[PDB]
Amino acid sequence: MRSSLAPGVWFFRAFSRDSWFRGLILLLTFLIYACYHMSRKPISIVKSRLHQNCSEQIKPINDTHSLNDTMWCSWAPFDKDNYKELLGGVDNAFLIAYAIGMFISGVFGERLPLRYYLSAGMLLSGLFTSLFGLGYFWNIHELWYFVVIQVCNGLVQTTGWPSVVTCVGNWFGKGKRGFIMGIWNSHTSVGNILGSLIAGIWVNGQWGLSFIVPGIITAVMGVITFLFLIEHPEDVDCAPPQHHGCEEPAAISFFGALRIPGVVEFSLCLLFAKLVSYTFLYWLPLYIANVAHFSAKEAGDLSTLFDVGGIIGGIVAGLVSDYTNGRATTCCVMLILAAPMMFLYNYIGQDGIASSIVMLIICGGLVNGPYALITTAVSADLGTHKSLKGNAKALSTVTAIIDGTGSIGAALGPLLAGLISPTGWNNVFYMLISADVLACLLLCRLVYKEILAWKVSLSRGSGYK
């Protein structure tokens, strides 16, 4: 009667139909790739329980029998002195088989329909984590069952990341890409926290129901992504995106995607940054133990503040790389200006709580900014490069190459950290410094290119059409 329109409906009216499905696809492929990081965690928490020093344990009525072993308490293929030398046998049977699958199970994303290929992966990840969980209810005590699962569970969870920036690549253009897909990259830090929290419930008590419940959540999300994944903007008659600058294009060959002018240098740079991010997080508890004399209940908060700094860095490196028309030169500067900050953290870390946090957030925002910006912005940019000439299709091969060359370094992390550990606890830091200096060396051709690319438009004095 005597009212105009309520301000909520007058606010939601202004967003046109263009900006509604483009807001749908972010909210959908945010949960789709958050469930993978939810279902990847719980081998990290159950790493602590499966071996216990049960000379300090309640109920010694399980036949100690003149000081025998830890058979009655710990799990039986992880009971003896090789528990540290077999857990590494388990997890390396994932990180290897995930970095071989990423080069191949992105190539199938070029050919198959994308929605079926995504749902037939999210209905198998939640089956294979669950079949890892089916050891407690059947009392399986052989080591060979617990490694042929995490191999077959490492060919399935490939299918996320080549088929998540394939959906987002088909809708968005060269608008504010580094900012949208920088805010959007909060899933790799909102997945870890919910993984550590949900799998933290059933740790002690009975541990079989710490894997099966994320394996149910992932396969439940695997059919909401079956019922609602609109791939192309023309299938529901929206507007097609910008120019990223008849017959539908068929495919691309794998070797034909290597000749794109950025895909080699933007991958053997990124292998030397995931290795830095693993080396630092492996090094930091061994640093704060023997020097800082610091409470270990807050180091778990430190290893979360590092990824919160990563969230901040994934947007700070995005805005600047948008408004300066160059993205390799942002990553090179934020890698060069990172090593004095980590050297200063090594020199100044003697404070307990106060000066540590502010020196740790900055080190979190300078080695996970340029890890984000090369796998969420230029990976959706080199795939839409002008040299494809429109008569091809390559967005799930460039992403596949960049992420597989990323995860090979994550596989070679523990294969080197345990090699220089007995020869000193400080060689790790020098390997970190060498890898971070070498990281801003592969980009040198692209930095040399983009300096001239700036100076062309500068020396013309606003050169235009």
- State yes or no: residue 248 binds its own copies (CB under 8 A): yes
Q: Which of residues 444-463 bind its own copies (CB under 8 A)?
A: none
Stretch that binds its own copies, among 227-235, 280-288, 350-358, 422-430 (CB under 8 A): 227-235
Q: How far is the CB of 235 from its own copies (least distance, A)?
A: 6
Stretch that binds its own copies, among 75-83, 231-239, 291-299, 367-375 (CB under 8 A): 231-239
Q: Is the Cβ of residue 246 or residue 296 nearer to its own copies in the bound state?
A: 246
- State yes or no: residue 3 binds its own copies (CB under 8 A): yes
Total binding residues toward its own copies, as defined by CB under 8 A: 23
- State yes or no: residue 16 binds its own copies (CB under 8 A): no
- State yes or no: residue 9 binds its own copies (CB under 8 A): yes
Q: Which of residues 106-145 bind its own copies (CB under 8 A)?
A: 112-116
Whether 154 and 104 have beta carbons less than 8 Å apart is answered as no
Q: According to the 3-state scheme, what is the secondary structure of the chain?
A: CCCCCCHHHHHHCCCCCHHHHHHHHHHHHHHHHHHHHHHHHHHCCHHHHCCCCCCCCCCCCCCCCCCCCCCCCCCHHHCCHHHHHHHHHHHHHHHHHHHHHHHHCCCHHHHCCHHHHHHHHHHHHHHHHHHHHCCCCCCCCCCCHHHHHHHHCCCCCCCCHHHCCCHHHHHCCCCCHHHHHHHHHHHHHHHHHHHHHHCCCCCCCCHHHHCHHHHHHHHHHHHHHHHCCCCCCCCCCCCCCCCCCCCCCCCCCCHHHCCCCCCCCCCCCCHHHHHHHHHHHHHHHHHHHHHHCCCCCCHHHHHHHHHHHHHHHHHHHHHHHHCCCCCHHHHHHHHHCCHHHHHHHHHCCCCCCHHHHHHHHHHHCCCCHHHHHHHCCCCCCHHHCHHHCCCCCCCCCHHHHHHHHHHHHHHHCHHHHHHHCCCCCCHHHHHHHHHHHHHCCCCHHHHHHHHHHHHHHHHCCCCCC
- State yes or no: residue 237 binds its own copies (CB under 8 A): no
Q: Is the Cβ of residue 159 or residue 329 nearer to its own copies in the bound state?
A: 159
Q: How far is the CB of 382 from its own copies (least distance, A)?
A: 21
Find all residues with CB under 8 Å of 2, minimum gap 6, and list them.
none
Among 56, 63, 81, 235, which residue interacts with its own copies (rule: CB under 8 A)? Answer: 235
Whether 143 and 122 have beta carbons less than 8 Å apart is answered as no
Q: How far is the CB of 194 from its own copies (least distance, A)?
A: 25
Q: How far is the CB of 12 from its own copies (least distance, A)?
A: 9
Q: How far is the CB of 123 from its own copies (least distance, A)?
A: 15
Stretch that binds its own copies, among 225-233, 306-314, 347-355, 404-412 (CB under 8 A): 225-233
Q: How far is the CB of 6 from its own copies (least distance, A)?
A: 6
Q: Is the Cβ of residue 6 or residue 61 nearer to its own copies in the bound state?
A: 6
Stretch that binds its own copies, among 6-14, 155-163, 423-431, 452-460 (CB under 8 A): 6-14
- State yes or no: residue 228 binds its own copies (CB under 8 A): yes
Q: How far is the CB of 302 from its own copies (least distance, A)?
A: 35
How far is it, in rounded angstroms, from Cα 114 to Cα 109? Answer: 6
- State yes or no: residue 6 binds its own copies (CB under 8 A): yes
- State yes or no: residue 247 binds its own copies (CB under 8 A): no
Q: Is the Cβ of residue 26 or residue 433 nearer to its own copies in the bound state?
A: 26
Q: How far is the CB of 250 from its own copies (least distance, A)?
A: 10
Q: How far is the CB of 1 from its own copies (least distance, A)?
A: 6
- State yes or no: residue 236 binds its own copies (CB under 8 A): yes
Q: Residue 81 carries which side chain, given as an amino acid letter?
A: D
Q: How far is the CB of 170 from its own copies (least distance, A)?
A: 10
Show the CA angle centred on residue 45, arms to residues 40 and 49, nearest 5°.
140
Stretch that binds its own copies, among 7-15, 79-87, 336-344, 400-408 (CB under 8 A): 7-15
Find all residues with CB under 8 Å of 80, minimum gap 6, and list them.
69
Q: Is the Cβ of residue 63 or residue 235 nearer to its own copies in the bound state?
A: 235
Closest by CA position to 128, among listed 147, 105, 115? 147
Q: How far is the CB of 234 from its own copies (least distance, A)?
A: 11
Binding mask 59-98 for its own copies (x = CB under 8 A): ----------------------------------------
Enumerate binding residues for its own copies (CB under 8 A).
1-3, 5-9, 112-116, 226-232, 235-236, 248
